[PDB]
Amino acid sequence: LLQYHYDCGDFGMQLLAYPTRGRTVHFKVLDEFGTRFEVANCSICMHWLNTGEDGGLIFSAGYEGCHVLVKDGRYVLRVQLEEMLLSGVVAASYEVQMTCPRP
Amino acid sequence: LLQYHYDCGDFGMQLLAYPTRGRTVHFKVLDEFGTRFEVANCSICMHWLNTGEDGGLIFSAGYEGCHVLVKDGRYVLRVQLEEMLLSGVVAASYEVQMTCPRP
Numbered sequence: 001l002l003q004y005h006y007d008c009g010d011f012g013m014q015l016l017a018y019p020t021r022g023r024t025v026h027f028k029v030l031d032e033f034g035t036r037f038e039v040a041n042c043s044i045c046m047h048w049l050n051t052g053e054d055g056g057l058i059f060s061a062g063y064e065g066c067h068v069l070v071k072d073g074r075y076v077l078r079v080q081l082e083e084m085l086l087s088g089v090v091a092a093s094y095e096v097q098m099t100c101p102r103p
Numbered sequence: 104l105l106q107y108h109y110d111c112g113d114f115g116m117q118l119l120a121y122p123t124r125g126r127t128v129h130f131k132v133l134d135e136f137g138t139r140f141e142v143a144n145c146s147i148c149m150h151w152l153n154t155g156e157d158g159g160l161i162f163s164a165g166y167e168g169c170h171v172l173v174k175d176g177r178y179v180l181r182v183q184l185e186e187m188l189l190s191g192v193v194a195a196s197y198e199v200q201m202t203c204p205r206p
């Protein structure tokens with residue numbers, strides 16, 4: 001499987017994913033219509049992509065960033081992870097709802 | 104003064120500005136509430152910043168990009184240009200409404 005978890009900060013949250021076997025990870029943000037948006041560095045939307053010292057991918061998003069929605073007094077962002085082979089095919093896809101503050 | 108003009112393309116438009124005396128140019132996109140957003144490379148919003156061969160700054164924006172509004176069957180994007188000194192102070196500010204297709 002794919003190792004992932006998310007942390008809640010003061011001004012935003014970050015999602016850390018660890019792919020195996022040389023695979024890569026693509027993050028896609030979802031809106032209320034189910035449309036999928038590729039995640040890239042975006043200062044206007046408060047989206048950022050970085051690699052950790054352990055070799056993991058880190059997607060950090062501000063609470064007031066693009067497509068982060070407010071429901072029941074909590075920040076919620078629906079992100080789908082696509083774990084892919086170097087050929088460009090998707091090996092596995094996971095969907096996670098980042099809800100801050102937890103639970 | 105500051106030299107600028109915009110061109111209408113098929114899928115988007117680009118704004119070209121030419122600052123003098125070593126000044127720099129900052130592009131800010133405006134929404135309907137008057138809030139000012141700094142323009143940077145943003146694949147999700149279809150905003151891009153590049154420098155031309157003549158040394159000018161080029162801001163290209165897709166017609167379906169962020170804050171591009173539809174009024175009277177035309178794409179309209181309100182952009183404010185800040186011409187600044189290397190000290191960080193604003194020397195001059197111009198506001199332009201990019202309307203495509205012209206007029």
Ligand SMILES: *[C@@H]1O[C@H](CO[C@@H]2O[C@@H](C)[C@@H](O)[C@@H](O)[C@@H]2O)[C@@H](O[C@@H]2O[C@H](CO)[C@@H](O)[C@H](O)[C@H]2NC(C)=O)[C@H](O)[C@H]1NC(C)=O
Pocket residue numbers: 041048049050060
């Ligand atoms: C995407 O952008 C990051 C920089 O984003 C920053 O960090 C966020 C938390 C945000 O709040 C701002 O502080 C910053 O804009 C790039 O990251 C750095 O990566 C370069 C390249 O390896 C490295 O030289 C820098 O030292 C890094 N910065 C820090 C503070 O360690 C990142 O490279 C960009 N990614 C792509 C693909 O363009």
Ligand SMILES: *[C@@H]1O[C@H](CO[C@@H]2O[C@@H](C)[C@@H](O)[C@@H](O)[C@@H]2O)[C@@H](O[C@@H]2O[C@H](CO)[C@@H](O)[C@H](O)[C@H]2NC(C)=O)[C@H](O)[C@H]1NC(C)=O
Pocket residue numbers: 144151152153163
């Ligand atoms: C910001 O991004 C551009 C690349 O954006 C591209 O062009 C747009 C029209 C878009 O539709 C896509 O095709 C692309 O993502 C960067 O530009 C290039 O700049 C580098 C650096 O000088 C150069 O090596 C490349 O050859 C350029 N690409 C081309 C096609 O000429 C630009 O550098 C980025 N700016 C910043 C500040 O990060």
